[PDB]
């Protein structure tokens with residue numbers, strides 16, 4: 403493959419998807435951290451007009467990441483980037499070679515993106531009822547096989563969900579959010595035990611994956627979430 | 639590939655996506671029309687728990703589509719099915735083999751799914767401002783090359799959008815919707831001329847594609863939409 407520069411941010415779960423994929427592929431790449439509170443003026447016009455992470459500059463000459471060349475192809479959207487790494491590295495295991503398994507992989511990601519992630523942000527940012535979060539977690543849990551990862555062998559499906567389960571845990575166990583203070587620890591426990599014991603086992607296995615743990619700085623993310631969302635209950 | 643049975647509906651743009659993909663691949667398959675006004679009792683427990691079209695039953699023994707076998711693999715979600723057909727038919731052209739080109743294909747689809755389709759349904763069903771529909775259309779148009787289809791050769795990107803542009807046109811030119819009566823023909827003209835001339839040429843090219851025209855029944859869709867959505871406007 404041609405050279406890869408990844409524009410990313412430790413706080414951002416969509417960006418961690420891209421980091422996990424590159425780690426699974428053992429890809430050589432140059433990282434560049436974007437401060438989302440203080441973005442470089444060059445980032446939107448030169449790299450990503452949406453002004454978000456993650457993004458990749460692919461190819462072109464060897465340049466510093468803050469001096470991108472217009473000759474590199476600019477790419478964005480986390481789920482596009484994960485399948486891009488999978489297509490660059492066909493022996494990475496990010497996607498099965500099997501058509502049915504690939505479809506089941508993407509079907510799982512659709513459950514994550516359409517049900518679980520919106521239900522989490524509704525609960526976390528707005529204090530919506532936990533009802534939809536349980537419904538979405540039960541649905542995602544029902545797609546899991548008895549053992550292993552989303553379609554057995556680790557794949558893009560696990561990459562898609564792991565950064566969000568990790569930051570849900572960080573938020574809940576620290577009571578960060580707009581939901582009633584004190585419910586957080588109860589909800590994470592409920593999502594990982596009893597009726598949700600399979601989901602709890604799934605989360606354990608995700609968090610133990612080397613490509614996850616090597617791209618997750620739990621202390622940094624916890625501190626960044628606490629600072630950013632401290633005022634959810636108190637701001638007028 | 640193994641045997642393919644497609645559960646579909648003429649009215650449904652999501653299902654037309656799959657039909658276009660199968661036509662581009664010259665795939666052998668058995669269609670079955672799902673009565674969306676009176677869905678068969680067996681459809682949700684035996685084929686698709688979400689009770690939506692499209693769905694595919696893949697493989698297993700030869701069965702009547704109204705008696706699906708538990709041995710066939712059941713698949714759903716239109717964009718999953720389109721990539722499934724792509725993966726089954728490597729000479730179909732639905733996806734390029736080139737990693738960058740595949741990424742740009744999926745990136746176009748993300749703009750269609752996240753901006754254009756929600757803005758259309760908001761205008762049609764919710765009487766939202768036309769502003770967001772033009773904004774979303776301008777973004778999609780900005781991704782088009784100077785000539786040709788979304789990434790050059792006809793691909794999953796065009797498959798994703800064509801059924802929705804076709805039904806937006808039918809709705810607008812026949813004044814079906816919650817927007818003020820008489821605005822529709824002017825909005826479709828606006829979306830296909832002037833600042834949207836490129837998008838107008840794209841729509842013309844899409845609707846002339848054989849896989850699109852052979853899977854679109856404009857008389858049926860116009861009559862079906864007129865009956866279904868006759869009450870979006872007050873009688874007073």
Ligand SMILES: *SC[C@H](NC(=O)CC[C@H](N)C(=O)O)C(=O)NCC(=O)O
Pocket residue numbers: 411413414415416417438453454455456478479480481
């Ligand atoms: S997590 C930080 C934010 N990134 C995204 O939301 C990416 C979403 C895309 N759809 C994707 O890659 O999947 C971010 O960069 N926000 C910009 C800001 O100004 O906060």
Ligand SMILES: *SC[C@H](NC(=O)CC[C@H](N)C(=O)O)C(=O)NCC(=O)O
Pocket residue numbers: 647649650651652653674689690691692714715716717
């Ligand atoms: S167009 C007919 C409806 N299908 C869908 O909405 C499919 C959406 C999926 N996300 C997809 O395949 O992309 C439909 O079947 N409606 C029936 C119902 O009861 O909702």
